[PDB]
Structure 1
């Protein structure tokens, strides 16, 4: 659950990178991100009850 709801926060970080810059030359290697997911999991494994 935290993985998916944390992954949707990445999906939005995907939809803001592609809509600008150079729409021709792009790879998911520039379109993804770590923190929206990484921090999402790191948060659960510690702060949750």
Structure 2
């Protein structure tokens, strides 16, 4: 009652989300900086950390 399975789905989901933490940090940095008149969801996102 104190130990649990953490199967392949949940582990991959958590590694996905800790990947997403970096890219949401990146987009929050980019959007917290100005110059938003030309931005598109292509440069703030970056699939290399993911």
- The TM-score, its normalising length taken from structure 1, stands at 0.58
Partner in structure 1 of residue 41 of structure 2: 28
Higher normalized contact order (CA 8 Å, seq sep 6+, divided by chain length): 1
CA-to-aligned-CA distance 1:1-49 (integer Å, 9 cap, x gap): 1011111111101111122251111111121112221xxxxxxxxxxxx
Q: Rg: which structure is higher?
A: 2
User: Where in structure 2 are there 5+ consecutive unaligned residues?
Assistant: 1-13
Runs of 4+ aligned structure 1 residues displaced above 3 Å come to none
User: Where in structure 1 are there 5+ consecutive unaligned residues?
Assistant: 38-49
Q: Distance in 2 between matches of 1:36 and 1:10?
A: 7
